[PDB]
Coordinates of C-alpha atoms and ligand atoms in Angstrom, one line a residue:
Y4 CA 16.0 126.4 -10.7
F5 CA 13.0 126.0 -13.7
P6 CA 12.8 129.2 -15.8
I7 CA 10.2 132.1 -14.6
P8 CA 8.4 133.8 -17.3
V9 CA 8.3 137.5 -17.0
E10 CA 4.6 137.6 -16.0
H11 CA 5.8 136.3 -12.5
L12 CA 9.4 137.7 -12.6
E13 CA 8.7 140.8 -10.6
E14 CA 6.9 138.7 -8.4
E15 CA 10.2 136.0 -7.8
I16 CA 12.9 139.4 -7.6
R17 CA 10.4 140.0 -4.5
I18 CA 10.9 136.7 -3.2
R19 CA 14.8 135.9 -3.5
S20 CA 15.1 139.3 -0.9
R21 CA 22.6 134.1 -2.8
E22 CA 21.9 130.1 -2.4
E23 CA 21.1 130.1 -6.2
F24 CA 24.6 132.3 -6.6
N25 CA 26.3 129.6 -5.0
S26 CA 24.7 126.9 -6.7
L27 CA 26.0 127.5 -10.2
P28 CA 29.1 125.6 -11.1
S29 CA 33.0 127.2 -10.8
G30 CA 33.8 125.8 -15.1
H31 CA 37.3 123.2 -13.0
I32 CA 35.1 119.8 -12.9
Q33 CA 34.6 120.2 -17.5
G34 CA 38.2 122.2 -17.7
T35 CA 41.7 122.1 -18.9
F36 CA 43.8 124.3 -18.5
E37 CA 47.1 123.0 -19.3
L38 CA 48.3 126.4 -22.2
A39 CA 47.5 127.9 -19.8
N40 CA 49.7 127.4 -17.1
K41 CA 52.6 126.9 -18.9
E42 CA 55.5 128.6 -17.3
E43 CA 56.2 130.9 -20.7
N44 CA 52.5 132.3 -19.9
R45 CA 52.8 132.9 -16.4
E46 CA 53.3 136.5 -17.3
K47 CA 51.0 137.1 -19.8
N48 CA 47.6 136.1 -17.0
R49 CA 47.1 139.5 -14.8
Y50 CA 45.5 136.8 -11.9
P51 CA 46.3 133.3 -11.8
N52 CA 43.6 131.2 -10.4
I53 CA 41.3 133.3 -13.5
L54 CA 42.4 131.6 -16.8
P55 CA 40.6 130.4 -19.8
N56 CA 40.1 126.2 -20.6
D57 CA 41.9 125.0 -23.0
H58 CA 38.9 123.9 -25.6
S59 CA 37.3 127.5 -25.8
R60 CA 40.8 129.2 -25.5
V61 CA 40.8 132.3 -28.3
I62 CA 44.2 130.7 -30.3
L63 CA 46.3 133.4 -32.4
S64 CA 48.1 132.9 -34.9
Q65 CA 51.8 131.3 -34.3
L66 CA 54.0 134.3 -34.6
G67 CA 59.0 132.1 -34.7
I68 CA 59.3 132.5 -30.6
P69 CA 58.0 129.8 -28.7
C70 CA 54.5 130.0 -26.7
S71 CA 53.3 132.6 -29.2
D72 CA 49.7 131.2 -29.9
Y73 CA 48.0 132.3 -26.3
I74 CA 45.8 135.0 -25.1
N75 CA 43.9 135.2 -21.5
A76 CA 40.9 135.1 -23.5
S77 CA 38.2 132.6 -24.3
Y78 CA 34.6 132.9 -26.8
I79 CA 31.7 132.7 -24.9
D80 CA 28.5 132.7 -27.0
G81 CA 25.2 134.5 -26.6
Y82 CA 21.7 133.0 -27.1
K83 CA 21.0 130.7 -29.5
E84 CA 25.2 132.5 -31.4
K85 CA 28.0 130.3 -31.3
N86 CA 31.0 132.3 -30.3
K87 CA 28.8 136.0 -30.1
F88 CA 32.0 137.0 -27.9
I89 CA 35.1 137.3 -27.0
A90 CA 36.0 137.6 -22.9
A91 CA 39.4 138.6 -22.7
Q92 CA 41.1 139.9 -19.4
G93 CA 41.8 143.6 -19.6
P94 CA 45.8 143.7 -21.2
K95 CA 48.7 144.1 -19.1
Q96 CA 52.1 146.4 -20.3
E97 CA 53.2 142.5 -21.8
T98 CA 50.7 141.6 -23.3
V99 CA 49.1 144.9 -24.7
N100 CA 50.4 143.4 -28.8
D101 CA 49.3 140.1 -28.5
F102 CA 45.5 142.1 -27.6
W103 CA 45.3 143.9 -31.6
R104 CA 46.7 140.7 -32.5
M105 CA 43.3 138.9 -31.0
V106 CA 40.7 142.1 -32.3
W107 CA 43.1 142.0 -36.2
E108 CA 42.4 137.2 -36.5
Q109 CA 38.8 137.5 -35.0
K110 CA 37.8 140.3 -37.5
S111 CA 37.0 141.7 -34.2
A112 CA 34.6 145.3 -35.3
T113 CA 34.1 146.0 -31.7
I114 CA 35.6 146.7 -28.2
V115 CA 33.6 146.8 -25.0
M116 CA 35.9 147.9 -21.7
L117 CA 34.6 147.3 -18.1
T118 CA 36.7 149.0 -16.7
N119 CA 38.3 152.5 -16.3
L120 CA 42.3 152.2 -15.7
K121 CA 42.9 152.7 -11.8
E122 CA 41.0 151.5 -9.5
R123 CA 41.7 153.6 -6.3
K124 CA 45.1 154.0 -7.1
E125 CA 45.6 149.9 -8.4
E126 CA 45.6 149.4 -12.1
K127 CA 43.2 147.4 -12.9
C128 CA 44.2 147.6 -16.3
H129 CA 46.7 149.2 -19.1
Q130 CA 45.4 151.7 -21.6
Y131 CA 46.2 150.0 -24.9
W132 CA 45.4 152.6 -27.5
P133 CA 46.8 156.1 -28.8
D134 CA 45.4 159.6 -26.8
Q135 CA 46.6 161.6 -30.0
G136 CA 47.2 160.2 -32.9
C137 CA 49.2 156.8 -33.9
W138 CA 51.1 154.2 -32.5
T139 CA 52.5 150.6 -33.8
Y140 CA 51.9 148.0 -31.9
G141 CA 53.6 145.7 -32.8
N142 CA 52.6 144.4 -36.4
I143 CA 49.2 146.9 -35.7
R144 CA 48.9 150.1 -36.0
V145 CA 46.1 151.9 -34.2
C146 CA 44.9 155.5 -35.1
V147 CA 42.1 157.8 -33.0
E148 CA 39.7 159.2 -35.6
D149 CA 36.9 160.1 -32.9
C150 CA 36.4 160.3 -29.1
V151 CA 33.0 161.2 -27.9
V152 CA 32.4 161.3 -23.7
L153 CA 29.1 161.3 -22.2
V154 CA 28.7 160.8 -19.3
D155 CA 27.5 157.1 -18.6
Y156 CA 30.1 155.9 -21.6
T157 CA 32.5 157.0 -23.9
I158 CA 32.9 156.2 -27.3
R159 CA 36.7 155.9 -29.1
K160 CA 36.8 155.0 -33.5
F161 CA 40.3 153.5 -34.1
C162 CA 41.3 152.9 -37.4
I163 CA 42.9 150.1 -37.6
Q164 CA 46.0 148.4 -39.6
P165 CA 49.6 146.3 -40.6
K166 CA 45.7 145.0 -46.1
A167 CA 42.5 146.8 -46.3
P168 CA 42.0 149.4 -43.1
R169 CA 39.4 148.2 -40.5
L170 CA 37.5 150.7 -38.2
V171 CA 37.0 149.2 -34.8
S172 CA 34.9 151.3 -32.5
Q173 CA 35.6 151.0 -28.8
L174 CA 32.4 151.3 -26.4
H175 CA 33.9 152.2 -22.8
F176 CA 31.6 151.8 -19.8
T177 CA 33.1 155.1 -17.3
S178 CA 30.2 154.9 -14.6
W179 CA 31.0 151.8 -13.4
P180 CA 31.7 151.6 -9.3
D181 CA 34.5 150.9 -7.0
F182 CA 33.4 148.7 -4.7
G183 CA 29.3 146.9 -5.1
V184 CA 27.9 147.2 -8.8
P185 CA 25.5 150.1 -10.2
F186 CA 22.9 151.7 -8.3
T187 CA 19.8 151.6 -11.0
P188 CA 21.0 149.6 -14.1
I189 CA 19.6 152.5 -16.1
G190 CA 23.1 153.4 -18.0
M191 CA 23.9 149.8 -19.0
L192 CA 20.6 149.0 -20.6
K193 CA 21.2 152.3 -23.7
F194 CA 25.5 150.9 -23.4
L195 CA 24.3 147.3 -23.8
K196 CA 21.9 149.2 -26.7
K197 CA 24.9 151.4 -28.4
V198 CA 27.2 148.6 -28.5
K199 CA 24.3 146.4 -30.9
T200 CA 24.1 149.7 -33.0
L201 CA 27.7 149.8 -33.3
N202 CA 28.7 146.5 -34.5
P203 CA 27.8 145.3 -37.7
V204 CA 26.5 142.3 -38.6
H205 CA 29.4 140.6 -41.1
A206 CA 31.4 141.1 -37.9
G207 CA 33.9 138.4 -35.9
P208 CA 33.0 138.1 -32.2
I209 CA 32.5 141.4 -29.9
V210 CA 35.6 142.1 -27.5
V211 CA 34.5 142.1 -24.0
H212 CA 37.2 142.6 -20.5
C213 CA 37.3 144.5 -17.4
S214 CA 40.0 143.1 -15.3
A215 CA 40.5 139.8 -15.0
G216 CA 37.5 138.8 -17.6
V217 CA 34.9 138.0 -15.9
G218 CA 32.6 139.1 -13.7
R219 CA 31.3 143.1 -15.6
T220 CA 32.3 141.2 -18.4
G221 CA 30.0 138.3 -17.5
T222 CA 27.0 140.6 -15.9
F223 CA 27.5 142.4 -19.2
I224 CA 27.4 139.3 -21.6
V225 CA 24.5 137.5 -19.1
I226 CA 22.4 140.7 -19.9
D227 CA 22.7 140.4 -23.8
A228 CA 21.7 137.3 -23.8
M229 CA 19.0 137.4 -21.6
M230 CA 17.1 140.0 -22.6
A231 CA 17.1 137.5 -26.3
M232 CA 16.2 134.9 -24.3
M233 CA 12.6 137.2 -23.0
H234 CA 12.2 139.0 -27.2
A235 CA 12.3 135.3 -28.2
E236 CA 11.0 132.4 -25.5
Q237 CA 8.9 135.4 -23.3
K238 CA 11.4 133.5 -20.2
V239 CA 13.8 133.9 -18.4
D240 CA 16.8 131.2 -17.5
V241 CA 19.5 133.4 -15.5
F242 CA 20.6 130.3 -13.9
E243 CA 20.6 127.7 -17.0
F244 CA 22.9 130.5 -18.9
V245 CA 25.6 131.6 -16.2
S246 CA 26.2 127.9 -16.3
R247 CA 26.4 127.3 -19.9
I248 CA 28.3 130.2 -20.2
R249 CA 31.3 128.9 -17.1
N250 CA 31.8 125.7 -18.9
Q251 CA 33.4 127.7 -21.5
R252 CA 35.0 131.1 -19.2
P253 CA 35.1 129.7 -15.8
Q254 CA 33.7 132.3 -12.2
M255 CA 31.9 134.2 -15.1
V256 CA 29.6 136.3 -12.8
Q257 CA 32.1 137.2 -10.0
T258 CA 29.6 138.0 -6.7
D259 CA 25.9 137.7 -5.5
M260 CA 25.3 141.4 -5.9
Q261 CA 26.5 140.9 -9.6
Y262 CA 24.1 138.0 -10.3
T263 CA 21.1 139.9 -8.7
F264 CA 21.7 142.8 -10.7
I265 CA 21.0 140.3 -13.9
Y266 CA 18.0 140.0 -12.6
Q267 CA 17.2 143.6 -11.8
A268 CA 18.7 145.1 -15.3
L269 CA 16.4 142.6 -16.4
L270 CA 13.0 143.7 -14.4
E271 CA 14.0 147.2 -15.7
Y272 CA 14.0 146.2 -19.9
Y273 CA 10.5 144.7 -18.6
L274 CA 8.5 146.7 -16.9
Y275 CA 9.6 149.7 -18.7
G276 CA 11.8 148.4 -21.7
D277 CA 10.7 150.3 -24.7
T278 CA 9.9 153.9 -24.2
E279 CA 12.7 155.0 -26.5
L280 CA 11.7 156.2 -30.0
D281 CA 13.5 157.8 -33.4
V282 CA 13.2 161.1 -34.6
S283 CA 12.0 159.0 -38.1
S284 CA 8.8 158.5 -35.5
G285 CA -0.3 157.0 -24.6
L286 CA 1.4 159.8 -22.8
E287 CA -1.1 158.7 -20.0
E288 CA 0.4 155.7 -19.6
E289 CA 4.0 156.6 -19.7
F290 CA 3.0 159.5 -16.9
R291 CA 0.7 157.1 -14.6
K292 CA 4.4 154.8 -14.6
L293 CA 6.2 157.9 -13.7
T294 CA 4.0 158.7 -11.0
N295 CA 5.0 155.4 -9.0
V296 CA 8.9 155.4 -9.1
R297 CA 9.3 155.9 -5.7
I298 CA 9.9 158.8 -3.7
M299 CA 13.5 156.8 -1.4
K300 CA 11.7 159.4 1.9
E301 CA 14.5 157.0 3.8
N302 CA 17.0 159.2 2.1
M303 CA 15.6 163.0 3.1
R304 CA 17.0 163.0 6.3
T305 CA 19.0 166.7 5.6
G306 CA 15.7 167.9 4.7
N307 CA 13.5 167.3 6.7
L308 CA 15.7 167.8 10.2
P309 CA 14.0 170.8 12.1
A310 CA 16.7 173.4 11.3
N311 CA 16.6 172.9 7.7
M312 CA 12.0 173.1 7.1
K313 CA 12.1 176.6 7.5
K314 CA 14.5 176.8 4.5
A315 CA 12.3 175.3 1.9
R316 CA 9.1 176.6 -0.1
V317 CA 7.8 173.1 -0.2
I318 CA 8.2 170.9 2.5
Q319 CA 7.6 167.7 0.6
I320 CA 9.8 168.9 -2.6
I321 CA 13.9 167.9 -1.2
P322 CA 16.5 167.1 -2.3
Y323 CA 17.5 163.4 -1.3
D324 CA 20.7 163.0 0.9
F325 CA 22.8 161.4 -1.4
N326 CA 22.3 164.4 -4.3
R327 CA 22.4 167.3 -2.6
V328 CA 24.5 171.2 -2.5
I329 CA 26.6 171.2 0.4
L330 CA 28.0 174.4 1.1
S331 CA 30.3 175.6 3.9
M332 CA 29.4 175.1 7.2
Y333 CA 22.8 172.9 10.1
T334 CA 24.4 176.3 8.0
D335 CA 25.7 173.5 4.8
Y336 CA 21.2 173.3 3.9
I337 CA 20.0 175.0 0.6
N338 CA 17.3 172.9 -1.3
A339 CA 19.2 172.3 -4.4
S340 CA 20.4 168.9 -5.9
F341 CA 23.2 168.2 -8.3
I342 CA 21.1 166.9 -12.0
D343 CA 23.3 164.0 -14.2
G344 CA 23.6 166.1 -18.1
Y345 CA 23.8 164.2 -21.3
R346 CA 27.6 165.0 -21.7
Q347 CA 28.5 165.1 -17.7
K348 CA 27.7 164.7 -14.0
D349 CA 26.6 166.9 -11.6
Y350 CA 26.4 169.1 -14.8
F351 CA 23.1 171.8 -13.7
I352 CA 22.0 172.7 -9.5
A353 CA 17.6 172.5 -9.6
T354 CA 16.8 174.4 -6.4
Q355 CA 13.8 176.3 -5.4
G356 CA 13.3 180.2 -5.8
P357 CA 15.2 181.6 -2.9
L358 CA 13.8 182.7 0.0
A359 CA 13.8 186.6 1.9
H360 CA 15.6 183.6 3.9
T361 CA 18.0 182.0 2.0
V362 CA 20.0 183.9 -0.2
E363 CA 22.8 184.3 1.7
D364 CA 23.2 180.3 1.5
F365 CA 21.7 180.7 -2.6
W366 CA 25.0 183.0 -3.7
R367 CA 27.2 180.9 -1.6
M368 CA 26.0 177.3 -3.2
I369 CA 26.6 179.7 -6.5
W370 CA 30.0 180.7 -5.0
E371 CA 31.2 177.6 -4.4
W372 CA 30.6 175.7 -7.1
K373 CA 31.6 177.3 -9.6
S374 CA 27.7 178.3 -11.1
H375 CA 27.9 181.1 -13.8
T376 CA 24.4 180.8 -15.2
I377 CA 21.6 180.9 -13.8
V378 CA 18.4 180.0 -15.7
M379 CA 14.9 181.5 -13.8
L380 CA 11.7 180.0 -14.7
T381 CA 9.3 181.9 -12.7
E382 CA 8.2 185.5 -11.7
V383 CA 9.1 187.0 -8.7
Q384 CA 4.9 187.1 -8.1
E385 CA 1.9 185.5 -9.8
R386 CA -1.0 185.1 -9.1
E387 CA -1.5 187.4 -6.2
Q388 CA 0.6 184.7 -4.8
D389 CA 5.1 185.6 -3.8
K390 CA 5.9 183.3 -5.6
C391 CA 10.4 184.0 -5.6
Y392 CA 12.5 186.5 -3.8
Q393 CA 14.7 188.7 -6.1
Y394 CA 17.4 187.5 -5.3
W395 CA 19.5 190.1 -7.7
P396 CA 20.0 193.0 -7.8
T397 CA 18.4 195.6 -10.7
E398 CA 19.8 199.3 -11.0
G399 CA 22.7 199.3 -7.8
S400 CA 24.6 196.5 -6.9
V401 CA 23.6 194.6 -3.6
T402 CA 25.5 192.7 -0.5
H403 CA 24.1 189.5 0.8
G404 CA 26.5 188.7 3.6
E405 CA 29.9 188.3 1.7
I406 CA 29.4 188.9 -1.9
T407 CA 28.4 191.1 -3.6
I408 CA 26.4 191.6 -6.7
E409 CA 26.2 194.3 -9.0
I410 CA 24.1 194.5 -12.3
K411 CA 26.7 195.1 -15.6
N412 CA 24.0 195.0 -18.6
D413 CA 20.2 193.7 -18.3
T414 CA 18.8 193.1 -22.3
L415 CA 15.0 192.4 -22.7
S416 CA 14.6 190.3 -25.9
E417 CA 11.4 188.0 -26.4
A418 CA 10.4 185.7 -23.8
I419 CA 14.5 185.8 -22.1
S420 CA 15.3 189.2 -21.0
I421 CA 18.9 188.7 -20.1
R422 CA 20.9 189.7 -16.6
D423 CA 24.6 190.4 -16.4
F424 CA 26.0 190.6 -13.1
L425 CA 29.9 191.3 -11.0
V426 CA 30.1 188.8 -8.5
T427 CA 32.4 189.8 -5.2
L428 CA 33.4 188.2 -2.6
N429 CA 34.3 190.5 0.2
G430 CA 43.4 187.9 -7.8
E431 CA 40.2 184.7 -8.1
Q432 CA 37.4 187.4 -5.5
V433 CA 35.2 189.0 -8.7
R434 CA 33.8 186.3 -11.2
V435 CA 30.5 187.0 -14.4
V436 CA 27.5 185.9 -13.8
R437 CA 25.2 185.3 -15.9
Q438 CA 21.1 185.3 -15.8
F439 CA 18.3 183.8 -18.4
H440 CA 15.3 184.9 -17.3
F441 CA 12.5 183.1 -18.4
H442 CA 8.8 185.4 -18.7
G443 CA 7.8 182.3 -21.7
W444 CA 6.1 180.4 -19.0
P445 CA 1.8 181.5 -18.3
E446 CA 0.7 181.6 -14.7
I447 CA -1.3 179.0 -14.8
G448 CA -0.7 176.2 -17.3
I449 CA 2.1 175.2 -19.9
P450 CA 3.3 177.1 -23.8
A451 CA 1.6 175.9 -26.6
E452 CA 4.0 177.1 -28.7
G453 CA 7.1 176.1 -27.6
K454 CA 9.4 177.9 -30.9
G455 CA 10.5 180.3 -27.1
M456 CA 11.7 177.2 -25.0
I457 CA 14.2 175.7 -27.9
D458 CA 16.0 179.3 -27.9
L459 CA 16.5 179.6 -24.3
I460 CA 18.0 175.5 -24.5
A461 CA 19.9 177.2 -27.3
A462 CA 21.0 180.6 -26.0
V463 CA 21.6 178.9 -22.4
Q464 CA 24.0 176.6 -24.1
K465 CA 26.3 179.0 -26.0
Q466 CA 26.9 180.7 -22.6
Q467 CA 28.0 177.0 -21.3
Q468 CA 30.2 176.9 -24.7
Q469 CA 31.8 180.7 -24.0
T470 CA 32.3 180.9 -20.6
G471 CA 32.9 177.0 -19.9
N472 CA 31.8 175.0 -19.0
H473 CA 30.4 174.4 -14.8
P474 CA 26.9 174.0 -13.8
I475 CA 24.0 176.0 -14.3
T476 CA 21.3 177.3 -12.0
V477 CA 18.0 175.7 -12.1
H478 CA 15.0 177.0 -9.9
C479 CA 11.3 178.5 -10.5
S480 CA 9.9 178.4 -6.7
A481 CA 9.2 175.1 -5.6
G482 CA 12.2 173.6 -7.4
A483 CA 11.1 170.6 -10.0
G484 CA 8.2 171.2 -12.2
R485 CA 9.8 174.2 -14.6
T486 CA 13.3 173.5 -13.9
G487 CA 12.1 170.0 -14.4
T488 CA 10.8 170.4 -17.5
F489 CA 13.9 172.1 -18.4
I490 CA 17.1 170.4 -17.4
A491 CA 14.1 167.5 -18.9
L492 CA 14.5 169.2 -23.0
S493 CA 18.1 169.9 -22.4
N494 CA 19.1 166.8 -21.9
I495 CA 16.5 165.5 -24.7
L496 CA 17.4 168.5 -27.5
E497 CA 20.9 167.6 -26.9
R498 CA 21.0 164.1 -27.7
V499 CA 18.3 164.0 -30.4
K500 CA 21.1 166.7 -32.1
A501 CA 23.6 164.3 -31.0
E502 CA 22.2 160.1 -31.5
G503 CA 19.0 161.0 -33.5
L504 CA 17.4 159.3 -30.9
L505 CA 14.3 160.4 -28.6
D506 CA 13.7 158.8 -25.2
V507 CA 11.6 161.0 -22.6
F508 CA 10.1 158.8 -20.1
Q509 CA 13.9 157.7 -19.1
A510 CA 14.7 161.1 -19.0
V511 CA 12.3 162.0 -17.1
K512 CA 12.7 159.1 -14.9
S513 CA 16.1 159.2 -14.5
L514 CA 15.0 162.8 -13.1
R515 CA 12.7 161.2 -10.2
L516 CA 15.4 159.7 -9.6
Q517 CA 17.5 162.4 -8.6
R518 CA 14.9 164.4 -7.2
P519 CA 11.8 164.1 -5.7
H520 CA 8.4 165.3 -8.2
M521 CA 10.5 166.8 -11.0
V522 CA 8.9 166.8 -13.8
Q523 CA 5.6 167.2 -12.3
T524 CA 2.2 167.7 -14.2
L525 CA 1.2 165.6 -17.5
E526 CA 0.8 168.8 -18.7
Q527 CA 4.6 169.4 -19.0
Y528 CA 5.9 165.6 -19.3
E529 CA 3.2 166.5 -22.8
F530 CA 4.8 169.6 -23.0
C531 CA 8.2 167.8 -23.4
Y532 CA 7.2 165.2 -26.6
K533 CA 5.3 169.3 -27.7
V534 CA 9.2 170.4 -27.9
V535 CA 10.8 167.8 -29.3
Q536 CA 7.8 168.2 -32.6
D537 CA 8.6 171.9 -32.7
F538 CA 12.3 171.1 -32.6
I539 CA 12.5 168.0 -35.1
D540 CA 10.9 171.2 -37.8
Ligands
CL147 CL1 41.3 155.9 -15.7
CL148 CL1 34.4 142.4 -10.7

């Protein structure tokens, strides 16, 4: 196994689709585990087969209690940086205090948690931080100063002290699935950049932990190391590195499926890599790339089954089977897909304009997924083409099957008209649903301003925080295009306000992987940039 030039990475990935992974050394033959197996230390290890060797063991200061030296953690090098990380086992009740003493004695500023607390009812790691307020863990008082919950990870700011108090930031990756590795490595690369951002140049080693302290924790350390190697050597050698880190902590990467995943992340980071940009700071090429996002046509069964054919305005813009909106019972089908927002999963329902023969279903979707906000981006007719069925009453009330819609208020503001309805189901019988009907999109082309588009996003956000905080029903006609533009800018703008960063490309690309042809035309993509420019001023 020799190094792969990045020039040939994509090809070698194809060719290798297990044997490589099985040739790695299990770090056990050049190692010594005397200290880890001491009787005194038995109860301190979560898994008795996954133990630090004596040489790279993190060694705590001796606290007159015997065998107080020990913790299940080991130093791990980065690409050209001795001891960049500490790969630690996720602490348990009995070692929570010893854990913080490590963070303190090692001068660490960052903890990377790659596990959830419980997994399918099995406790994979004990909570070692206060929910609210403060807690003294031994001679170290930890205090929560902030918690920010984004969709793929959450971020916690601690203030630890026993003279100078110190700020430790915990980055907790929530998205990692129970069984197997993730799906895209998109989330993990963004997460890994946020760690680079929040760790100070002067700080101690980064504490990375999962359950056993080898596996996720390993795939994470390797992906960082190998990004470094690309950015320096223009070549990647995953095999020689995993081999190296195992002689510091054995078993570092745990699965065949994990080893492959390092490569996928590395490829993603090469092919698409730098498309993020800071709000401080051509599109043609980026759009070509977006357009080469494969459509998972295998994974589109339900939407193509014969009965469901007739229910779609465009038999080509149709939900993937995994993130499709499913209703109470082929009556389970509505051309509509769940889409991740910036702060939570399944935050938007991106749907088509109801057909005259799918209003019943439409309103069942709204009712069954507790939607209270509808964003409409077309008019009923456009250029003499019937682009959406009017599903809402204008004057009185209308009953679409079991649901009843009665219109309470209807205010035509600048660009957006804003209707209010009492949706009933013929004491949890009645809701108030609010429709934002955007008249600011031209019958042909994109709008040339985007003040009115900023003002709609903004309007829908207040409505969300008030009628808090359910999934938003966005539709136009085809159910991807404008819906896409809107969902994209919603997420892009939230993050600009929040992180002061801007990655339109990945934003849209992430939309393409949830529903086909989401942002659709280069016009609409250009527009995204244009609205962000307008927002910045
Ligand atoms: Cl949890
Ligand atoms: Cl694991």
